[PDB]
Amino acid sequence: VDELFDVKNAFYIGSYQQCINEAQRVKLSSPERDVERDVFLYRAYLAQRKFGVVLDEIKPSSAPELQAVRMFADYLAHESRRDSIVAELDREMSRSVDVTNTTFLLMAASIYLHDQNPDAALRALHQGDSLECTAMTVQILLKLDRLDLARKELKRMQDLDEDATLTQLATAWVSLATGGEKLQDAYYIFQEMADKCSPTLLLLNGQAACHMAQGRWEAAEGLLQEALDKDSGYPETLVNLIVLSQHLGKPPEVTNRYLSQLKDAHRSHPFIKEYQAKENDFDRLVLQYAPS
């Protein structure tokens, strides 16, 4: 049995503080596990947007796996340095990588995904052999609308470990994208993880998305309100409430409030930029039918 089971589980379902708390309590039964624990501790600080902790405490003497988390911390924290980090990352990958260092590949692929470079991120993850590497591949293939390829990688995880948390999560993502009878499958996975662990912002909107997909808007309202009470700034809640609001017949002043609220979510969800782009696309097309 895996001494870090609770730690990794808390992280992947979005319960970052519980991850941080339980990482600081476990007993050091190895130096291999010791570094692995620290990786999740610091990725949890990344997830809480506390890049200063990650950046100050991982030193040049720190383990290679931690150097990889710190690389990712630099990129998220320092917008001006991003292009130069990616340039160096391309040079590393072209030179030589330790393929057994799955932590480095997930940190490489994390950087590429943010840099809107899924080919590079898949090219890195292809080199690794680990469950999160597959799980991250499933997510990227789903974003590429290749549900066919996603199913094959998910099937890999199902043969290796049906009951693992990443496999359940990947099953839910694959099911949410397949639709039909499978939307209920995804819902119960998200529910079962909420009622074993704790109903995090990630699981709350996970569940709401499965309701909204079956058109069950009223059943989704409770979940989004609970998510809103926990954290007024989690953007996915705000976006989902815009959808839910309109499907419940509420006034456009509510959709407008959630749009202004989303500009201060200070978590970098693309929705506002795509919205402003569609503002600009529309202004441009108006002048195409009537050049004033």
Binding site: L122, M136, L169, L176, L201, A209, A213
Partner: protein, 332 residues
Amino acid sequence: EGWGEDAELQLPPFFVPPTKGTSPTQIWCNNSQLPVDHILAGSFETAMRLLHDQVGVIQFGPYKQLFLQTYARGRTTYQALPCLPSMYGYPNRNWKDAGLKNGVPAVGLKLNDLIQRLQLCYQLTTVGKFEEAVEKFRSILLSVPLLVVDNKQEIAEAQQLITICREYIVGLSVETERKKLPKETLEQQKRICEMAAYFTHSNLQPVHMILVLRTALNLFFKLKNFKTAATFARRLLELGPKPEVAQQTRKILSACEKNPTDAYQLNYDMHNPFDICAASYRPIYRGKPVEKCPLSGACYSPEFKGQICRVTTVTEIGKDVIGLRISPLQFR
């Protein structure tokens, strides 16, 4: 019903990053010809092309709110792995059997949502807030082509709803212009009465037609056109006004019949059907030439063909169009 083609065995026909599949918003566009589905898809140019050919829109500026708010309800979002860009979900209306290729997006504006808003429009009208009623009426009107509707009777209702919004918008437009005009000259007062009489042929709810007949009854009584004023009074009374107004009306009527003479020849024909030019506010008698709004049915005297309809504020007067499309029914 033999063994069939289901029994015949057929012809079996580095690292490379994979290529994208079609996005679910593109699937929406492929499978739908209704404007709201393309707007939910984020495909504004194809949506505008559809509204243009079907319903006659050329000035899309006044659609900006509808378009953008519709766009915002199109996709849900959920986080997969921590610290990576979130996922998007694309809820389909035929979700039980949508599959990969056949989806078409969930319905977010229903016809009864609009029929319900008619009531706030009516109240606003009754209490006199014409500018706000017109704004609320036009919003219902422009929203109708964003519907998705199941059966032939709802297509009928959605058309009647458009016609209701038109009737009110042009009627209230007549009254608001009558109030901006000067009442100094005799010839100026004659023009005001005409407009008050035109408004009398708008097809509104009885409670509102009582108010416009009351208005026409005063102006024609002050003009000393008692023969025509009397028939406004007889028509007001037949709608069944509240007791105080019946009494004020009966007293004005028996005074009209004691002198049933019109002092002036006005340009208003009681026994002759016409439509109200929604730009110049003059009557167009049923035989004479008209150019129409292809969505609302607003009538215009022919000078205005090609201009922006004053009622809808977005359509081309007299353009030939396919017709409103708001249901899969219409694509047999």
